[PDB]
């Protein structure tokens, strides 16, 4: 067979959350939680810990790697020698490097041949999950849950955040979910069975 | 989009202003009844409020959803509000002032640059009238536009503690307020007020005209007076309990005289100078609208 | 003690799909 | 009429470059020229026979009813050139005017109903706008680089390797190029399904179908506001550092007069036994030898290049001494939003802000002081005044999702805190073709 | 809203002693916020009250 | 003892405690209770907890906290006392007087 | 030369009472409270054009002195200190200023100190050549005589 | 000289130069004005600078 795709598990995104904390802020009342709910919700509550001053959404540098020639330390993609003067050295920190970076971003996405396979997964016994998380959960989920703000609901010590997120999530127009969702391709075969998460 | 009732948004049960009285719900009007005053040798006189500058802050677009209601109510009533004179919120407010803006004011009190069909919002003409005046709250810090922090409080006193004859006369004795009270009566009152959806009140104050407006001024005088009361506790030079029989009477000396006190104290919420600039500017705009 | 600041981004955990020999279904 | 409303039109080069070949392969008559003696019914016949709202302008003065017909039906007239456009129409309303136009992109998808020959959108054009104009040699350098990143041997690509002439280098530029049969004369023949294979009907930018599918997602990524963190221009002004938010741009005060920077404005002049860097002031023409006492001025600097060190230092001194507001539009920079505890690791003199090469990316830092706790009641009073000069001209923190994740007073929300957008949290569902969707809002 | 306790990260403090006459010039001025003070030895509140 | 409810193996105790606790006239609680002094400041924020403690000590602790909360001494008091004990027309330039 | 006070100014007698520490914006500040209006200006940059007379200086906080001098620099205050006594010298331009007097001492010295101010007489300063390019900075004089 | 424009500190010179370049009758330019590819090889040959 040709290797037309690159089978993977627990995929990288193109965008990731990045967070700057002020370490001096810290809620005094420690929040005990169910060990199961802590393992679903927990990467999130760490990333958006109390005292996080800023939470940006950057390009995922782990995905848009330096193997593609893309630095991302300045917060925008930059590529060394694509759009360049001819007959001289390019010069450091050129702004053209931004345009080049977008191109390579656009290139790397145009050639993303990744194909997800389900990774290690869990079927928490439900009575072991707090109801807010039990609603969001759909039978099963990857142990690498990733991070979504919707998970902070009734977990963040920060009151207004929980009130706002609760407000949004309670509205009909938005509906968080996690794990194995029923889909139109359910039961379709292709050596193995397609499913939606 | 919520249609605005001929009597204003404040007519709606959705926008009722109420305060706990030792924990039980009560209209502000039935709290103001508890208040009683002792006149002193000094005398408040309300010289005319300087007219507000025409200059609205520039309508720069800003990331995110500004929470303007919470901003104003915290700047006026909340405990130790911060960043009250930060410019972004009022810049979005001035964006609401524009004749055909995309921005919208939710009944929630947030501003959304999106048309946002899912969330109900005030009629844009009304918030145009309202933002056209209250965006000026962004001028509160700039030296050219700072409001008289001292004289305006005379009006506050007159509109709160003033007897109908004194309110006609425009001159009243400086007063010492007092009322039967509970453990943290002023703080709890400021909590009860900071939760008020005041934008209904302000939007109605600016949008309505003629008989509906004057009827709004009579129907809501007690509300305005309660906001005035919370500010007065914030600026009162001195506040103390007096143990009369088994009852404890809170005593605020003196109503209508801004002491410019900024250090925190147990009895009441406290204004930093930025809160004074803000509150004074707010009083300039509100008293100007109230007297027309 | 002096007040300080810190940072965190979410980590990649992408791996090549595991080869299992066991099967879920008849 | 609204800005979207009006009489649409485009340059002939845009027509030729894009819509015309699609007209060819779709097997339609070439859309009729409008003499201006032309009937609206004829234009209707053409839009009918060509399945696009397009007609080519021929010769002067389109008649009223036909013009209004183009207006109601949003027909896209193809003007050979934009000079004196209004003279080509007979406006009874006399409200048509040059400079009254609104320029904008128009996706080919919005005119062609034939989806098969549409692989892109506004996005790619918007990207190309960012690109420097490229000599063909630079295009080859770019292609050789993309090849280098992807480990292909691009040697002898685009080249002739003749035994006696040596190696020779043809241009690699070939935008919108198609595969087309030629006459023996060398001229191109219009595509014919009767002889040429179906694969040649439209070279789909020469990309595999999957690459187009993914290309669409990537263009949606590139043009997203959150990615767009290369910022333009900075306002220099001498305020106290009071506004916590990084995205703050001081508003210009009511008395200030806007002034374009020009070399002409500054000069040497005698003044009290020395040669001052005088600023003559265009509204009134008064010369101002001293940096202090100058009229309030919102000066705008489009291009720093060629500006003297003396003039620059004098503009800065005028910001400080005369409260000048100096926008500098030529700065491209990449802002980093610091938290108060990390301070300012990277610093910037006014001199460098004035004298940095035009093409280089600056890297400014901006505090978000939202999370700075109140001073103790007994901390000594500060007689000094912290001051600031550099501000962004546009919102920074386009990337921001959340902010101030602490409690103000246990229950209350801090001013300037931001909750995540609802969309971050809306796992929707899939559309019947398999695209991602948000949840339905309300019903149905 | 709480008063800080851990020592905070203050902006750098430039002292400009101001003489009877001096040549002010603003080459190499800082653009970042920076507190400016006229006097030295401004830590004058030494009488601490228990 | 209210904590023994549905925990003590002893049946009648649980029936009796359940009976008392179910009556409207008695109502156990534990931890952070909302109170009239909630949000009141005094350097830090006062709050109420439902402690397991004798009502005597609870009454004394309450009384002490309220004394502190009503004392309302400020820097002005210290600079007045300081002024009494200092040479006449000495000046004090401390913090905000309040 | 004795610079005239500009027409928009307001005379203000100094008293310790006008200045006080005050919370402003997450910082304590040497606030000034202008007697004509009563308004407190936390910061030196925004203050009304004040012509402040100081008869005393005794008992004055050093912090308040720095705040006032900053108000000169930032709000263009004119600040007439009447307590100071000084000898003067009138240096020729060739001679230059052999020595200088800090505002820190003019504002915080015992009342009996004899200051020695120097004042250049610039009648004979050479003119620059017509073609010589400008130099950058401005010369400044912060401290002026009240009398000839 | 045309290069001095908006680079010379000398004002009158920059004014006179800008004045000449902003006339319709004169226009400075520096670089590759012209190109001439071969008819068969399609490579460039005679370029005017």
Residue numbers in the entry:
A (entry chain C): 150 to 346
B (entry chain E): 1 to 292
C (entry chain C): 74 to 99
D (entry chain C): 841 to 1284
E (entry chain C): 100 to 149
F (entry chain C): 298 to 395
G (entry chain B): 1088 to 1235
H (entry chain B): 298 to 346
What does the paper say about this structure?
Viral transcription is highly regulated, as demonstrated biochemically in viruses of the Reoviridae. mRNA transcription in these viruses is activated by external actions, for example, removal of their outer shell in multi-shelled reoviruses and binding of S-adenosyl-L-methionine (SAM) in the single-shelled cytoplasmic polyhedrosis virus (CPV). To reveal the mechanisms of transcriptional regulation of viruses within the Reoviridae family, we determined the cryoEM structures of six CPV/ligand complexes in the presence of magnesium ion: CPV+SAM (i.e., ‘S-CPV’), CPV+SAM+4 nucleoside triphosphates (NTPs) (i.e., transcribing, or ‘t-CPV’), CPV+SAM+GTP+ATP (i.e., ‘SGA-CPV’), CPV+SAM +GTP (i.e., ‘SG-CPV’), CPV+GTP (i.e., ‘G-CPV’), and CPV+ATP (i.e., ‘A-CPV’) at resolutions ranging from 2.9 to 3.1 Å. Like the atomic model of unliganded CPV, the atomic models of these liganded CPV all contain two conformers of the capsid shell proteins (CSP-A and CSP-B), two conformers of the large protrusion proteins (LPP-3 and LPP-5), and one conformer of TP in each asymmetrical unit. We discovered that the large sub-domain of guanylyltransferase (GTase) domain of CPV turret protein (TP) also has an ATP-binding site and is likely an ATPase that mediates the activation process of viral RNA transcription and capping.
